[PDB]
């Protein structure tokens, strides 16, 4: 019942032991060293240590140290001095490794929130994820992890319970594992949805959402567009988005157009409503079209390059959202000098300032209907400054997001590697508890074990490869 006995898992040559013993210490010590080094680096760096976005690195590196140091201690403690492990020492050793894995998952979860918020709320992030808060998140996350890991030492082992002990690990209760694997498994799933959501929905293409693809005068482009829809020249508001309830507020906008409809000012305005969803709001929106010929609806799926021609041409872009994950429409629109009239939600709060657009109360056709009116009076002066102000700000945001989406991808990589190393092993462990174990499989377990250590090796290296800032902070020493 000794920890890290490869021998209950397979019989070895003296050669293979020799080989393994050498790959083990040399790798183990190596992996201990580089993860120390990672720590000694971020802790000497003012920049790194107490920046929230890089807090997971410090957390992974104690996570990788915890397991690697326990690998190498346990190995020495067994194979060199031949001390043998009591229940509680064994359990403390295993508690060390689970704790490390939990904390790894803990760190990617807390990082994944850090990334969402950094892109969801680019300004407000800096006051939402603050240094003291960041630390308290990590401490809690670590104490939970440590707490879950010590449970077997307080009696949730199979010994103090007398319940079926696992085939795989001595001194431990099988369904305690299931708890521990399940917590971590589901939490992995949410971390993956999370990162995926961020990566499919976040940011824009600054190579494509760019004024420079358009030739001419805005006026000329506007007039040409407007005649393509057989309307005369007139202030042109665009909506593009899902037709739906309580999400992208085309229902709010269709209310606002009926408010204005009677006004004299309305005949001065032009509405281009683009999108699809509810058959009802389409029915409604189509009726407003056949009612007024200064309204124009498009459910026909539209060319992205045309949507850029639109952003390039219309005066205002109307974003009546109840919810806006990453404010893409706004950012694209403004990049091309469309001034945004938008609900004051998510990042729209951070993005639109008083010198770049108009904000309203979500859900309110009256606050919108007036916005539009203020926007039609605003358009009696010149809007060049506004569209210019819009362009840069959006650029700034677009870039910041490109940075923060990069740090996100690093963490996806770190995740993918982490699922890869540990994925097989937990599958096997679940497989072990449930069902029946083999004696081949028992070996590919022991083999897969080492990928736990391997993961701890490669994490420091991709920090190194993937973040200049880590790299530069390390050169600050020598
Ligand atoms: C490599 C360890 N595997 C084993 O102890 C078993 C499963 C007996 O197989 C082996 C396989 C190889 C070795 C050897 F000789 F290379 F060190 C020792 N044991 C594994 C055991 C393990 C325990 C708990 C979890 Cl959740 C995962 C793996 C472990 C031990 C200590 C630190 C880390 C890390 N990072 C990983």
Author numbering: 100 to 301, 1001 to 1196, 333 to 412
What did the study's authors say about this model?
The endocannabinoid signaling system in mammals is comprised of the endogenous lipid messengers anandamide and 2-AG and two homologous GPCRs, CB1 located in the nervous system and periphery and CB2 expressed primarily in immune cells. CB1 is the most abundant GPCR in the central nervous system (CNS) and regulates diverse brain functions and behaviors, modulating neurotransmitter release and neuronal excitation through pre-synaptic activation of Gi/o, GIRK channels, and arrestin/MAP kinase signaling. To gain further insight into the molecular mechanisms of cannabinoid system modulators and enable structure-based ligand design, we sought to crystallize and solve the atomic structure of the human CB1 receptor. CB1's orthosteric binding pocket is highly hydrophobic, as expected for a lipid-activated receptor.
To promote LCP crystallization, we replaced the third intracellular loop (ICL3) of CB1 with the thermostable PGS domain, which recently proved essential in solving crystal structures of the human orexin receptors. We incorporated the point mutation T210A, which was previously shown to stabilize the inactive conformation of CB1 and increase thermostability. Finally, we truncated CB1T210A-PGS by eliminating the first 89 N-terminal residues and the C-terminus after residue 421. After purifying this construct from Sf9 insect cells, we obtained LCP microcrystals that diffracted to 2.6 Å resolution, solved the structure by molecular replacement, and refined the structure to Rfree 0.23. At the extracellular surface, the second extracellular loop (ECL2) and membrane-proximal N-terminal region preceding transmembrane domain 1 (TM1) form a lid over the orthosteric pocket, which almost completely shields taranabant from solvent. Taranabant makes multiple contacts to both TM1 and TM7 and fills the orthosteric pocket directly inside the TM1-TM7 opening, potentially acting as a ‘plug’ to block endocannabinoid entrance. Taranabant adopts a conformation in which the chlorophenyl moiety extends toward TM5, the cyanophenyl buries deeper into the 7TM bundle, and the trifluoromethylpyridine projects into the putative access channel between TM1 and TM7. Of the 24 residues within 4 Å of the ligand, there are only three polar sidechains – D104 whose acidic sidechain points toward the extracellular space, S1231.39 near the access channel that forms a polar contact with taranabant's trifluoromethyl group, and S3837.39 that has been implicated in agonist binding. In contrast, a large number of hydrophobic residues (including 6 Phe, 3 Met, 2 Trp, 3 Leu, and 3 Ile sidechains) line the orthosteric pocket and make a variety of hydrophobic contacts to taranabant, burying 1109 Å2 of surface area. The major divergence between CB1 and CB2 within the subset of binding residues lies in the membrane-proximal N-terminal region, where F102, M103, D104, I105, and F108 make van der Waals contacts to taranabant.
